[PDB]
Amino acid sequence: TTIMAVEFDGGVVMGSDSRVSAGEAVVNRVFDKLSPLHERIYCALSGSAADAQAVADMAAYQLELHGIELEEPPLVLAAANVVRNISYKYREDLSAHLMVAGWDQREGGQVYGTLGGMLTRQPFAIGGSGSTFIYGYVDAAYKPGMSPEECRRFTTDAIALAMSRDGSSGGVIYLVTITAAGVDHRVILGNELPKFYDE
Amino acid sequence: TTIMAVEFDGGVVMGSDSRVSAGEAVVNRVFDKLSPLHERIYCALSGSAADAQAVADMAAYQLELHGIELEEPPLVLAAANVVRNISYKYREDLSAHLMVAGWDQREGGQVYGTLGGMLTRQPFAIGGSGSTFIYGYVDAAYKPGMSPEECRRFTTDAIALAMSRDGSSGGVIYLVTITAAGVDHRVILGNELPKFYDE
Amino acid sequence: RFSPYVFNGGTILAIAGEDFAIVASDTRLSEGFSIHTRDSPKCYKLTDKTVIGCSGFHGDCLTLTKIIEARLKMYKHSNNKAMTTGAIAAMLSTILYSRRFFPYYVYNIIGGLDEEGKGAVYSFDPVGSYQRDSFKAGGSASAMLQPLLDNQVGFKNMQNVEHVPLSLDRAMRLVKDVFISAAERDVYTGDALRICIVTKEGIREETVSLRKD
Amino acid sequence: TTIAGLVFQDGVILGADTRATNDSVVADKSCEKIHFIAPKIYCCGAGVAADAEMTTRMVASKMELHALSTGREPRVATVTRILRQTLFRYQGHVGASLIVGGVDLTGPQLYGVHPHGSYSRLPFTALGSGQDAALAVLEDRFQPNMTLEAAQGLLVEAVTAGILGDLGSGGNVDACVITKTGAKLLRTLSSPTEPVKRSGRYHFVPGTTAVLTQTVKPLTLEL
Amino acid sequence: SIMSYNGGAVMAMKGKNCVAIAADRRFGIQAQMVTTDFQKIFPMGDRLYIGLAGLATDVQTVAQRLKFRLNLYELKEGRQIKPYTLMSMVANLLYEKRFGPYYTEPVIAGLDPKTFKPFICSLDLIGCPMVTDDFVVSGTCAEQMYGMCESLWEPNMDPDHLFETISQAMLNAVDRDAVSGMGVIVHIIEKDKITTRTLKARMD
Amino acid sequence: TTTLAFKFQHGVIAAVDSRASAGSYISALRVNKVIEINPYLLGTMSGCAADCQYWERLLAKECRLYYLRNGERISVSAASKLLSNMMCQYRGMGLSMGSMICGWDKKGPGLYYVDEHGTRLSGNMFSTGSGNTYAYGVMDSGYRPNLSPEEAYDLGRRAIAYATHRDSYSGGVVNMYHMKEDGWVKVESTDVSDLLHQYREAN
Amino acid sequence: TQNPMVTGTSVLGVKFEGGVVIAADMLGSYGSLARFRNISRIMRVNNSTMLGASGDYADFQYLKQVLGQMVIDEELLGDGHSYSPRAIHSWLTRAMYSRRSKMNPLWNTMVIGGYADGESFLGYVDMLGVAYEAPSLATGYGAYLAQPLLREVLEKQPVLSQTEARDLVERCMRVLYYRDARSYNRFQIATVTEKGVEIEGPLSTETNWDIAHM
Amino acid sequence: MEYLIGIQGPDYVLVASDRVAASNIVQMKDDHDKMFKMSEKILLLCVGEAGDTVQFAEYIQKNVQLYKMRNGYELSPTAAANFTRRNLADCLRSRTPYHVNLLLAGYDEHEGPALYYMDYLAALAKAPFAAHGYGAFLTLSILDRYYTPTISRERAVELLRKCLEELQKRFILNLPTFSVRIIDKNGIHDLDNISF
Amino acid sequence: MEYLIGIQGPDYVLVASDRVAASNIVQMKDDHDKMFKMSEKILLLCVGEAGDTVQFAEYIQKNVQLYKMRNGYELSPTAAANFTRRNLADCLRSRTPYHVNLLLAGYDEHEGPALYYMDYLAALAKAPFAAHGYGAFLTLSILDRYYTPTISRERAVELLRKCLEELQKRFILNLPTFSVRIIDKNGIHDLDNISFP
Amino acid sequence: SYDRAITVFSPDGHLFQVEYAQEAVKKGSTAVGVRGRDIVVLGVEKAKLQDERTVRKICALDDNVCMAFAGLTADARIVINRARVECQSHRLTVEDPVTVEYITRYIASLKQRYTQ
Ligand SMILES: *[B]([O])([O])[C]([C]C1=[C]OC2=[C][C]=[C][C]=C12)[N]C(=O)[C]1[C][C]2[C][C][C]1O2
Ligand SMILES: *[B]([O])([O])[C]([C]C1=[C]OC2=[C][C]=[C][C]=C12)[N]C(=O)[C]1[C][C]2[C][C][C]1O2
Ligand SMILES: *[B]([O])([O])[C]([C]C1=[C]OC2=[C][C]=[C][C]=C12)[N]C(=O)[C]1[C][C]2[C][C][C]1O2
Ligand code: NA
Ligand code: NA
Ligand code: NA
Ligand code: NA
Ligand code: NA
Ligand code: NA
Ligand code: NA
């Protein structure tokens, strides 16, 4: 898996690969690892599929009732805390990392890491087995003040680069752009991927 | 460790970090991991320090006598097979990866990987614990036809990027440019390193 | 895997005289081959006529010490009197035995006066076995100090020697010598020697320097 | 053990503590950890005491044979090679951590040799259980081309930091100053812990030990 | 532990122009006492003795193999061995088995056959020598002996003063060790004579 | 440890050594390995010192409660049974406690062996501890049911002294008791090495 | 926590005339990966107390929530009483010991710095409940590198000024950056005085690499 | 699990050994002999692991017999005990260590009677009396109690019988019969077996 | 390591058990009894781990005695054997499993004599004859060879003696004395112990 | 769980529920007990169509103890079976059998508990 989230002025971009693998076996080659927690809040799933899906579902349920009682859409900080609390309370029994990103009327576009029950707000964040091979790339290619299109391009190049080096990442790239306007879901097919050195 | 070698028209560029560490302890912060095997043949050391130094010494001794019996400087392919044969014969008892690069009047500037006793010629190659974090970077930044100065710049940026992400790499960057003209040794100090995103 | 214990070192010693009791300890707190602090004495005043020496895993020393303090208060409120040295010793055995299957890693030596005003020493193992002694050494250097005490205080292995009782002056010099010898040979004993003297007048304290390496 | 080394203006200074511990019990308060290799080559030892003793003894012996045959003063790189290749063959089973310091026709050199056979040439180094205390003092105040007196001071401070901070280290600081005109062995250059005296009045009156058997064998017949 | 299988204690102590060497006399296998007169101190010259504690079989093998090399040495050299040379000879013997050692930790005590100056030393199981100017200890009660020795030892003791110090240091040390004891034997080595004494010791 | 007890014409003899060991280190040279529950009830102790002291003191508290509740002392069979049930309750927990409950009740002299497994045997001779085999050899060789009090005291003191000589985990003093119809009497607390020296001097 | 995840290295601390100073780098490592190079491992507890933590970051963030809420609770009473540095240190010992005793520790080693009633406070607590006071503290690998330098200066001059303590701490952070492979050249320095708790950062040490030519 | 006992008197050595050859829960032999004649005045009593005991005892026996053939005289009990210890100690750190516990009883023309105890590690001890096996835990204190250095052979057999009776009473293993032999200036003498 | 034996005849059940109570290498008791009276016409012979044997046997005994007190009649040997099996099987997968091997011998007015074998797993078998312990490996073939269903009590004791002699001859463990009892229409009868010099 | 206090004090200091339970005893069949020298006798007052055995008011608790009752017979059965279990539980915990006073003390404390 390679998951990635980038903050911009007015929203976030989230991306993931599509490979689900049981060892050397690709069980699902077109899995969308970007799940909605609320109207403008999404999470990026990595690690154990069963744990990631269980946490995402409980967080979506908790946030739905929270949103209704508060008479407003939940804050992205409330969503990130909801996820972080489940991941931290059950840290010895869960093996998933759910990156939480989205938009708010108070803080706007924000990206949060919950790795092992911690919580940190990042300009961008990468996760999954594939993130290992692109740490230097994201450090060399990240520039502050990127536009929504520049963030999508960055996420696509970084995820394509990891997909090519990582046996556990592959398939298509799923992109999601969350702004005040709504959410744009996009798919970059395995044939239309950006090309780099591959020898 | 982060070791790197790049072929260009007329020679090679080799680079390394300078950190020698026993777990969390930096035992030597200024170690030069680029060792001469011959006048225009060098190797880049990584893995077990005792094994890497032992192999390098036996290879230098074997190649010196080879060069004298042949009345010519050894081919970089002969140096590559000398290191490779040692690493392969003793693959269960050795734990080092010696990248071999240099210049020949026959094949010019060539880079060879000897990982676990295998032998492969590469346009560029990276090794060490730090190489993991820069696979995507070298795949995105490598361009065919780079000049000696462009290769040095690439090696420096890639090694600086790994040094910043890898606990087992750090210090200064050692560069070596091997051409028909001779060898140029160069040092980029820990204060004069190229800067990228580091938060 | 996680180990709930760690060895922090320290040596304790207690001597009971006709009308006194001494409880001494070094002040070093260690971990591995490093020193946490050079000012960690191991004597804890419980009542005006009872002090306790504690040595071993320091997390347990702190905890057990606070438990003893709370228990003395609980007893004073229920019985309208302070716990005697003997009563503290019997109670401490039960607190240690309450943890027989997750022991407190503490070597305890109690020193005070009994109800006849005579000196009393009570020594324990981590799980609660105890008895009253005339003298006792505990902690890292206990094996070094104890045979000297057996010889010089118990008069063992000596023929044709006057069995003269132990005076406070004589005991004080002997505690100082054994802790100087212990600091020379035990890496976990050093920095300073805290001596607590219990008498009818009360509790006096002395601090004497020990080797810093 | 805290062993340290330092390269200054006109040579090298090797430093060592004097404690030998047998598992948390101090066995020797005054042992020599600075070993002779050649007149201008010395070696600090740490690790398995017997391995450090026999490996230094072996290379000093090989270096005497080398110097006798060549007719020349021995090189510091030769002792590094011989040590390295012997230790490598034993795969770390010969637990000798050594600091080789010396002066040859190429000037002062300092090396760290590890039990597995790896080495490094350095301007300053520290080994033993107290190596990080010594290394902190060296990193904090080392400057190249120090005067003999400035380098000796830094070395005594580095070994002392280890003596006080490390439980496995203690006693006195021994040092060896190697220059182009030979080596000055400063046995007990400093004692961080001043004489710890006591009222050790422990005397037994003759007859307090009960004896069961007695046999006197004279030797005056041989004398 | 291998060293505690048989147990035992050995100690050497330096005096003014004399040396002392003492050992316990128990031979036991784990908790069972077998013998109360086991020899642990072996003469290597008129004024030179070796004390061996540890695994009983290796105490006997090391003493026998050392006697072999010593006899060949004094025959080739035509002289009595010096104390320091006997130490080096034991070091070489023990270090030859560096990777499969004898389980014994020797103690050497003597006077120079020419200079008469007292010598005391000890070696670990793999032959690392340690010379001291006061005392050396080896055994299952090394902590007990270190405490007794550190407290009782004085610089220039006369033969009788030394005899009482080493006796009380051994007696009181081995009486806090379950697997050492069954008696103590002491040798006082002077220029003119050797005094050997067995002490009235605890038998439990 | 070495503990022994035997019934004879004049009651029950009960003897113990006094050594405590922390591995090979002698942590205590003289511990009391006998609990006096009441004037007609004793308990010898071997195994884990803390287990012995706590459980035998818990049996003592229960015996005391029985006397307050019934105005009569507990029988040796009921007291040994109470301790045996305490051990059964903690089986598999790693307790280590061998004891002999020795007394005099309405059925005359009583002697029971109780284990940390819950073993409970009545009998007229037992020995527990690391030195028990050495005590059995001596005790069995010199035993007659018609031994005089002084002949019985010699057998008890000798079985324990001889066990302390061979067993490295036994030593110190012999604490011997004689359980008579009108209650126990502490016979002696004698240094075992002085007894062994005395035996040797008679050879 | 049975297995720590994102961890922080050494936390330093030294008492000076008029307060305490603590220092800690801003790194969260995931094994050898310098995964988060911009996280604060220092916390202002109240006006008198500050805390720095080595070990698992998620466990530190939890403690920071529990501690922060305790301070809010106390401030709601507004009764003239407030937790002293010594009481926070005491609470943290009980909290760590309690978690250790349940075989589920909070995987941290902490340094509590304080200033109350004219006295400087410096205390250590580890994941087992081992606690104590000292004139200087250094957790993790800093106990081997930084503590010998803090003690060397405190031997010569037991009472340092705020500037003397600050320069010494900055020299320790430089030695730690050079010798600890799990450190980063980005750190904070927090100071507690009569004025309160001030956290400064991000700071960097000027490195020198001239030995690369020796 | 097997039993050896020796009692050395002023001019003799009395030895006994059980007669059981067992396999698992079965006594396969009730009349088995554990003693080995080395010389006219030396017996080697051997116990331990199944193969080791006879292999080791027989090798020593044939080499002791070889000495007699090569020189015209036999090895003394001391020389035989030390030769046995040298072989056992040399095998200790080898591929083939023998798990044997033994007793060597002998009579020398100059030195008199001797009893040597040796364990499988090859520690060698001279003893006035000794025993091997679990039985020694029940019988060593009987010998401590009744043995005196001037014990007559008549008294030694009653002391031996006391030990063997203790095994019948307290030892959980059968062991009903025992081989009994005595050595003096006139060689090795077979006595009647002790039976229960 | 301990021995139990039962031989069921036409109108009786003969049972025997060793009398050793042992600890480590020592015979602590030579007169120990391993039989437990449940009813006037039922014996439970119990063997196994040190604590378990008496704890289990006594609990069953007191509950069998409770049945007699509550109803005025005793449980039949079958009902007692099945009640014993139910308790042992219920503890099998619990925190407290009892490591006991046992024999239940009884006489019922209607069903006649019965011998039940039960192992620590709680398998229950009705047998004409049975034995427990290592001794059963040496004595089961003696009973296979000489037992006939019409064996008289006089002949049964001779057969029992043949089995006990084999243990003296071939079993490595001491076991010198044996408790012997027989049950019939008149209850439990104590016979003389079998003893060997 | 039903946690109502059934037996409580009345203004005069009476426990009416216990006094009402004594009224039920007063209506039961006369039971007489006599303690002799070597014997103890129990006698109870007494339908032709009834099986006498199923309705006997003289029960055995253990081999050495027996009892008779007067009052509510279903209540008696509960007291009797608890006494019977207790006699065996006493033999199991302490070995020795129950005394007449021990089992009387047990029955009396059971009765008292049901009043508080
Ligand atoms: B990734 O870290 O390699 C990946 C994430 C993944 C794949 O499929 C899903 C479905 C729902 C949430 C996350 C997710 N993990 C895997 O493919 C693994 C294989 C299997 C065992 C752990 C996990 O599921
Ligand atoms: B690298 O992979 O982290 C590195 C290679 C290295 C460093 O220093 C030398 C010296 C000579 C050859 C290679 C080399 N490895 C190390 O630094 C480690 C330190 C020590 C323990 C493992 C290995 O050697
Ligand atoms: B014996 O079994 O070796 C002995 C019993 C013992 C020791 O101290 C007491 C005090 C009270 C009753 C019994 C008792 N045990 C020991 O020597 C050891 C000391 C302690 C730790 C293991 C065992 O108990
Ligand atoms: Na891929
Ligand atoms: Na780095
Ligand atoms: Na010290
Ligand atoms: Na030190
Ligand atoms: Na020694
Ligand atoms: Na002893
Ligand atoms: Na003993």
mmCIF file with all atom_site columns, N, CA and C in Angstrom, chain I residues 69-82:
data_model
loop_
_atom_site.group_PDB
_atom_site.id
_atom_site.type_symbol
_atom_site.label_atom_id
_atom_site.label_alt_id
_atom_site.label_comp_id
_atom_site.label_asym_id
_atom_site.label_entity_id
_atom_site.label_seq_id
_atom_site.pdbx_PDB_ins_code
_atom_site.Cartn_x
_atom_site.Cartn_y
_atom_site.Cartn_z
_atom_site.occupancy
_atom_site.B_iso_or_equiv
_atom_site.pdbx_formal_charge
_atom_site.auth_seq_id
_atom_site.auth_comp_id
_atom_site.auth_asym_id
_atom_site.auth_atom_id
_atom_site.pdbx_PDB_model_num
ATOM 1  N N  . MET I 1 69 ? -27.620 -40.192 53.449 1.00 0.00 ? 69 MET I N  1
ATOM 2  C CA . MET I 1 69 ? -28.314 -39.416 54.457 1.00 0.00 ? 69 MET I CA 1
ATOM 3  C C  . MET I 1 69 ? -29.600 -38.759 53.934 1.00 0.00 ? 69 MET I C  1
ATOM 4  N N  . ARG I 1 70 ? -29.577 -38.239 52.695 1.00 0.00 ? 70 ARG I N  1
ATOM 5  C CA . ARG I 1 70 ? -30.754 -37.580 52.134 1.00 0.00 ? 70 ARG I CA 1
ATOM 6  C C  . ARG I 1 70 ? -31.875 -38.528 51.738 1.00 0.00 ? 70 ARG I C  1
ATOM 7  N N  . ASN I 1 71 ? -31.566 -39.774 51.340 1.00 0.00 ? 71 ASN I N  1
ATOM 8  C CA . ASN I 1 71 ? -32.584 -40.691 50.808 1.00 0.00 ? 71 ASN I CA 1
ATOM 9  C C  . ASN I 1 71 ? -32.861 -41.990 51.614 1.00 0.00 ? 71 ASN I C  1
ATOM 10 N N  . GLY I 1 72 ? -32.012 -42.306 52.584 1.00 0.00 ? 72 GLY I N  1
ATOM 11 C CA . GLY I 1 72 ? -32.196 -43.507 53.393 1.00 0.00 ? 72 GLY I CA 1
ATOM 12 C C  . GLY I 1 72 ? -31.690 -44.793 52.770 1.00 0.00 ? 72 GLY I C  1
ATOM 13 N N  . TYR I 1 73 ? -31.139 -44.702 51.568 1.00 0.00 ? 73 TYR I N  1
ATOM 14 C CA . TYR I 1 73 ? -30.534 -45.834 50.893 1.00 0.00 ? 73 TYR I CA 1
ATOM 15 C C  . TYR I 1 73 ? -29.238 -45.375 50.222 1.00 0.00 ? 73 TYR I C  1
ATOM 16 N N  . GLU I 1 74 ? -28.358 -46.326 49.943 1.00 0.00 ? 74 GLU I N  1
ATOM 17 C CA . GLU I 1 74 ? -27.088 -46.032 49.313 1.00 0.00 ? 74 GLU I CA 1
ATOM 18 C C  . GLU I 1 74 ? -27.153 -46.135 47.785 1.00 0.00 ? 74 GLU I C  1
ATOM 19 N N  . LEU I 1 75 ? -26.217 -45.461 47.092 1.00 0.00 ? 75 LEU I N  1
ATOM 20 C CA . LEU I 1 75 ? -26.078 -45.516 45.629 1.00 0.00 ? 75 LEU I CA 1
ATOM 21 C C  . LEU I 1 75 ? -25.593 -46.904 45.250 1.00 0.00 ? 75 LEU I C  1
ATOM 22 N N  . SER I 1 76 ? -25.993 -47.399 44.086 1.00 0.00 ? 76 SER I N  1
ATOM 23 C CA . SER I 1 76 ? -25.507 -48.693 43.601 1.00 0.00 ? 76 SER I CA 1
ATOM 24 C C  . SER I 1 76 ? -24.068 -48.522 43.115 1.00 0.00 ? 76 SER I C  1
ATOM 25 N N  . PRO I 1 77 ? -23.270 -49.607 43.011 1.00 0.00 ? 77 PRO I N  1
ATOM 26 C CA . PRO I 1 77 ? -21.911 -49.471 42.451 1.00 0.00 ? 77 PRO I CA 1
ATOM 27 C C  . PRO I 1 77 ? -21.872 -48.777 41.082 1.00 0.00 ? 77 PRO I C  1
ATOM 28 N N  . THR I 1 78 ? -22.844 -49.052 40.199 1.00 0.00 ? 78 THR I N  1
ATOM 29 C CA . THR I 1 78 ? -22.956 -48.414 38.873 1.00 0.00 ? 78 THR I CA 1
ATOM 30 C C  . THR I 1 78 ? -23.206 -46.901 39.009 1.00 0.00 ? 78 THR I C  1
ATOM 31 N N  . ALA I 1 79 ? -24.174 -46.515 39.840 1.00 0.00 ? 79 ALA I N  1
ATOM 32 C CA . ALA I 1 79 ? -24.497 -45.108 40.028 1.00 0.00 ? 79 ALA I CA 1
ATOM 33 C C  . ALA I 1 79 ? -23.324 -44.354 40.639 1.00 0.00 ? 79 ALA I C  1
ATOM 34 N N  . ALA I 1 80 ? -22.572 -44.994 41.553 1.00 0.00 ? 80 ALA I N  1
ATOM 35 C CA . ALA I 1 80 ? -21.400 -44.392 42.193 1.00 0.00 ? 80 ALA I CA 1
ATOM 36 C C  . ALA I 1 80 ? -20.256 -44.259 41.193 1.00 0.00 ? 80 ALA I C  1
ATOM 37 N N  . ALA I 1 81 ? -20.063 -45.274 40.340 1.00 0.00 ? 81 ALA I N  1
ATOM 38 C CA . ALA I 1 81 ? -19.029 -45.266 39.298 1.00 0.00 ? 81 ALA I CA 1
ATOM 39 C C  . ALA I 1 81 ? -19.314 -44.169 38.271 1.00 0.00 ? 81 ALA I C  1
ATOM 40 N N  . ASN I 1 82 ? -20.582 -43.987 37.915 1.00 0.00 ? 82 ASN I N  1
ATOM 41 C CA . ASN I 1 82 ? -20.992 -42.970 36.953 1.00 0.00 ? 82 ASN I CA 1
ATOM 42 C C  . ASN I 1 82 ? -20.943 -41.572 37.557 1.00 0.00 ? 82 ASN I C  1
#
